Design a protein around this ligand. Structure first.
Ligand code: HEM
Ligand code: HEM
Ligand code: HEM
Ligand code: HEM
Lengths: 146, 140, 146, 140
């Protein structure tokens, strides 16, 4: 995706401060809590009845590091998100059957987490840059749905 | 829904008559082809044209709508059971209800040349939006 | 936009049967009736209080031929919708201030009109092809918004 | 909104205190930058950072929300006048309300480190969705 040099550096700079493990589990957990219907893909994770139960669930945390880790390696290839996520896109469609709308919801929750985590450092321009990124990633992941 | 909307809906749905189930299957087919992402919710179905599973599901959908029309002045209670079902088990993302509503309008338009006037078109869109709102009211 | 040969021929074939004047006015009229808030861009058209008033308004019909005509010439350039509508995109943003969401609503109303007009000939596969086209045109028109 | 949602909302909005207006302007700025299309509704505003028009509008938006919180058990009536206004004059497309709601949550998240817990986050999202539903209820 095409990002200005300014947006490029802004995203890269903030991400160097991110604890991938923690943020990944935090974002996935808030997804399951704020949009309960997304729990349909995680019946095998166990107890997800309460926020506390969701945030303290070991499977949620493990998966947290997993998806965000892939997301992270994606930031190293902003010039070709489609190509970078082609295989994962095929996987979420043909085998996991995940409605692409979910990628967008997770993208927005991720933004909320970053703002909560960084406070005033997550300025409006920084947010705008990240909104472009998450939208780009969501589209790259939905690209091979058929 | 204004009283006029209620009149247009009943008139249009009456014309549908016994074709309801058949129109419900067509709308589903139209949805699966036009909006492929909606297929993620039916990985267990044979989604080929003329599939028995699609026709059968089409009639259930159609029957529910018919129930909604007959109880338009009290839909939340009339669809209470379906609301619980989509909210707690099926868990279909809300965005998808607008896609099916659109395909249902396309289906009605293609079969009701004389009844699908601009006014009726407007009332049916509001009606399906109200139905969709009821079906997702218990999600959170 | 990339369309299969099958979708290509399906769109082209049906469009040869379209009365641009009539369909354009019909679609624009239904837009104003079904989604009333879109009337905000046509205060200068006069009386739009009732469906009858809207469908029988001369300005609505004139504009009808106008936008659909541009839409029509667009079908002759499916390989480059962005390039074809660049100027109009800049116009709707900088001078007309039209929220891009409106292009999508009009695209769907157009599909309803075609189905109403052609009946059984507007088959599910034909609809799918047109849904791709209108989405492609809507995105091409929103491309230069800033 | 469950009674619990009503408690979380009031607690969170209380903390906002006198900063409401200031948070309302920030959210608007976040919206205009992240979702450029929303600018089509303010061609008459100077939309540069720190603009007086944006700060002023920000406070009006913030004041309305504060009114909604104080009357959460009767929002339709409490926002009746604004509902008429957006439906009959402003005519902002419904999709845009979700964009602002998102930017308002981002704004609260950035300023309320301790209060923005997963639960509160969930209640605030439902609250803004309810507000948006009320503001667009009279569109058709
Ligand atoms: C940008 C966001 C996302 C990225 C980058 C992503 C990435 C991944 C990756 C790397 C895997 C592991 C694949 C493997 O097992 O080899 C995966 C699995 C999976 N993802 Fe996604 N994912 C994303 C969003 C989502 C969302 C929103 C959902 C649904 C709410 C989802 C549901 C799943 C599920 C259910 C699995 C299988 C887990 C397992 O088998 O243990 N993913 N995803
Ligand atoms: C007007 C809107 C809709 C109505 C009235 C409706 C109605 C129904 C009804 C009556 C059932 C049958 C439940 C049973 O077997 O007891 C059902 C099942 C289901 N619905 Fe909904 N539905 C609507 C929209 C949707 C949408 C948008 C989707 C997703 C794209 C969806 C997906 C499903 C699925 C997957 C099932 C279960 C299928 C199965 O039995 O295997 N529904 N719906
Ligand atoms: C694919 C759909 C659309 C196409 C191809 C399109 C095309 C056009 C064209 C060719 C013009 C004439 C430009 C000129 O005056 O030189 C125009 C004008 C305009 N369009 Fe669009 N348009 C589309 C959708 C919309 C929508 C959805 C709205 C808003 C509801 C809209 C509102 C306007 C307005 C207000 C004008 C100015 C009319 C005048 O000054 O007389 N257009 N459009
Ligand atoms: C939580 C949702 C919202 C609330 C509570 C809200 C509240 C308000 C209030 C109180 C006013 C002041 C009216 C007056 O001057 O008397 C207003 C004006 C307006 N609103 Fe809404 N609004 C909301 C969302 C939106 C959205 C999504 C947009 C469009 C992106 C929007 C666009 C406008 C515009 C353009 C005005 C008039 C600005 C002017 O005075 O020039 N509003 N809104």
């Amino acid at each position: 995706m095409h990002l200005t040099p300014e947006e490029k550096s802004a995203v890269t700079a903030l991400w160097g401060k991110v604890n991938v493990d923690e943020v990944g589990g935090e974002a996935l957990g808030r997804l399951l809590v704020v949009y309960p219907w997304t729990q349909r893909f995680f019946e095998s994770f166990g107890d997800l009845s309460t926020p506390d139960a969701v945030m303290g669930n070991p499977k949620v945390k493990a998966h947290g590091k997993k998806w965000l880790g892939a997301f992270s390696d994606g930031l190293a290839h902003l010039d070709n998100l489609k190509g970078t996520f082609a295989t994962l896109s095929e996987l979420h469609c043909d085998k996991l059957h995940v409605d692409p709308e979910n990628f967008r919801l997770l993208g927005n929750v991720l933004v909320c987490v970053l703002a909560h985590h960084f406070g005033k450092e997550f300025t409006p321009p920084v947010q705008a840059a990240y909104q472009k990124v998450v939208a780009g990633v969501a589209n790259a992941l939905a690209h091979k749905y058929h | 829904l204004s009283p006029a909307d209620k009149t247009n809906v009943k008139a249009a749905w009456g014309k549908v008559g016994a074709h309801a189930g058949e129109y419900g299957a067509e709308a589903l087919e139209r949805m699966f082809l036009s909006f492929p992402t909606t297929k993620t919710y039916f990985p267990h179905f044979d989604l080929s044209h003329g599939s028995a599973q699609v026709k059968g599901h089409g009639k259930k959908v159609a029957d529910a709508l018919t129930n909604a029309v007959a109880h338009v002045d009290d839909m939340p209670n009339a669809l209470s059971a379906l609301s619980d079902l989509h909210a707690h088990k099926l868990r279909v993302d809300p965005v998808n209800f607008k896609l099916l509503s659109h395909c249902l309008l396309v289906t009605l338009a293609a079969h009701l040349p004389a009844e699908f006037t601009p006014a009726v078109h407007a009332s049916l869109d509001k009606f399906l939006a109200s139905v969709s709102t009821v079906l997702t009211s218990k999600y959170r």
